[PDB]
Amino acid sequence: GVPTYGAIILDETLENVLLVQGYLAKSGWGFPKGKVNKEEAPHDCAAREVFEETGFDIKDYICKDDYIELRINDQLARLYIIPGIPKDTKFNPKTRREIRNIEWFSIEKLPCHRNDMTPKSKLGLAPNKFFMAIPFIRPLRDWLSRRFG
Ligand SMILES: CC(C)c1cc(C(=O)NCc2ccc(F)cc2)[nH]n1
DSSP: OEEEEEEEEESOOOOOOOOEEEEEOOOSSOOEEOOTTOOOOOHHHHHHHHHHHHHHHOOTTOTTOOOOEETTTEEEEEEEEEEOTTTOOOOOSOTTTEEEEEEEGGGSOSSOOOOOEEGTTTTEEOOTTTTTTTTHHHHHHHHHHHTTO
16 A cells, blocks of 8 residues: 655644545544655655645645654555644635545544444444544553653
8 A cells, every 4th residue: 555644734822733535435523634646755745735725835844853753554654743724724625526624623522443233242343423532642642642642
C-alpha cells in the first residue's frame, strides 16, 4: 500500500479537532489525508491533501517531528499535528465532488474504540461514522498529554 499523509488540526483550546466527511466508500468522518505522489515529500503531500480537502494551508504550521503515524493493514498513515487553528476559520474544499462536509468535533466526545455487539451475542463491531478517525484518538490524547499536560 502507498503511504497516506494528512493532518490533525486542533483549535486554540485544544478541545476540538477538524474532521472531514466524504462520499460513498469514504462516507464517514476522518482526518483529511491522502495518497503520496511519486517523488513527493511527506510534508508536501500532507499540505496538499489538506489544502484540497479543507481549503486551509498548513504549510507554514507543519512541524516536522509532530505527527502520529499508524500502520493499518500494511498501509502507513501519518498525520501531522497542527494546533491552534482558530475555530472561526472558514474551510472550503476545492474537491467538492469528494468532500460532503467539514466540522469541528470535541476530542473528549469522539470514541477511541468501536463498540462490540456483545449485548446481541454477535461477533464484530457495530458501525461507527468515525471509523477512520478512531485509531488516532488515543494516540492523540496521549501525545497532547505529553506535549502540553
Ligand atoms: C473505508 C470506510 C470505512 C471509510 C473511509 C472513510 C473516510 O476516509 N472518510 C474521511 C475522508 C473522506 C474523503 C477524504 F478525501 C478524506 C477523508 N469513510 N468511510
